[PDB]
Design a protein around this ligand. Sequence first.
Ligand SMILES: N[C@@H](CCC(=O)N[C@@H](CS)C(=O)NCC(=O)O)C(=O)O
Ligand SMILES: N[C@@H](CCC(=O)N[C@@H](CS)C(=O)NCC(=O)O)C(=O)O
Lengths: 219, 219
Amino acid sequence: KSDVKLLGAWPSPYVMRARITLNVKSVDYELLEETLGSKSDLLLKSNPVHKKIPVLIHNDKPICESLIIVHYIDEFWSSGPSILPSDPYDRAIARFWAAYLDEKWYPSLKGIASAQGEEAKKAAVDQVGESLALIEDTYVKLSKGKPFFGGEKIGYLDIAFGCFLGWLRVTEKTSGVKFLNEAKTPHLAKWAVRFCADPAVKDVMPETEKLAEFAKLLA
Amino acid sequence: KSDVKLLGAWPSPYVMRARITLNVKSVDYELLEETLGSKSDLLLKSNPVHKKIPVLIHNDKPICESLIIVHYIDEFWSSGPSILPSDPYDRAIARFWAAYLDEKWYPSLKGIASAQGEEAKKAAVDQVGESLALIEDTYVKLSKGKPFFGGEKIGYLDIAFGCFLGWLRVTEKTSGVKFLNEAKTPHLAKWAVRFCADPAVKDVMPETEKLAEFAKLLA
Ligand SMILES: N[C@@H](CCC(=O)N[C@@H](CS)C(=O)NCC(=O)O)C(=O)O
Ligand SMILES: N[C@@H](CCC(=O)N[C@@H](CS)C(=O)NCC(=O)O)C(=O)O
């Protein structure tokens, strides 16, 4: 906490990645919230390039990009539970789907709410459904019967994907489409319950209607 | 070569990342070229998600995304010269600037040639100049007097940035603006000569006018 500070905002899924990873490692830290609508001077100093949260400040050194932050926490506090797979190929696959979720899935998740002003543009709803099917079978292959993407304990892809679960449930209630359930994604449904109930996740996973209130609050 | 195949295209900077990393590790491999304009069925099978090159096929297992590929090669062939820094913070900084070059710099490099049809839209030229200044001082801080971003031998960020040098020189000749030279970027200029002349780079670094011919060939 004296040595570790996290620049972020409570409803941010990427900030949650750092929070979860820090909890897994039992690393204490000070949380500095960003008033959304404007950017703090500390965020500007700490991340002049992207001006984005989260920013992990460890011993007065900035570490930017959530996935890079997760890697860093795992590699520095190496004596704690590993966040990344031990095997090089498992590592590459882990990293691929995390990058996939940020480049493709999450923007397409935002795409359901967004559009223009015609009728039925939401092939976005179809694509989110397809992606979740891709993730469902990805889980089956990676988990191999074990409760998480990373086995016994939550891992890199658990954190990378599970950090979106709140915003997913927001999208579900508003769009009317339940993407993640027992019918469509049976394995992910069971995993989602366990992940959201994990001690390193449950308190930093924001309430759904609370997130929804923020979403509707957002201009 | 029997065990390692690289799906790509010769003028691709991201494919070059894999080629360079493989050379550093002295890992032999078969090269399968993509006819640009269409996508091979192997590329479609090997990368159904992004349908992008490069794809490293190691023991009939696909590894996608160049930076993930670089990580994988470094972590699998771990007995060879390290491509990533040993220190966790140096690792995070390495990864940040690599990600920066792909998200911000290279798209803004393509931005100089691209536009609409008015006059003088190229604040793109200014931004490429600014970014190179950011990279120049980044080099000074990371190299610490040593010839490369990674010290003695080329490293992660050497490969991540140096893979763009051919397309940079193409942009320079066409735009008329020399971005990387002794006046603007003195340290990068000296490094560029060494990197391009490194045995793991020199043969897979395409000729400039040859790249330019491809660029003008490209519709
Ligand atoms: N690639 C970045 C994404 C960061 C990001 O976009 N954060 C959003 C919300 S989670 C934000 O509020 N950024 C400040 C901004 O977008 O201007 C990461 O993984 O850290
Ligand atoms: N993020 C990807 C970028 C891959 C990429 O965009 N490759 C380009 C040229 S280097 C390409 O030809 N992709 C096939 C396509 O864009 O459709 C990586 O680092 O591998």
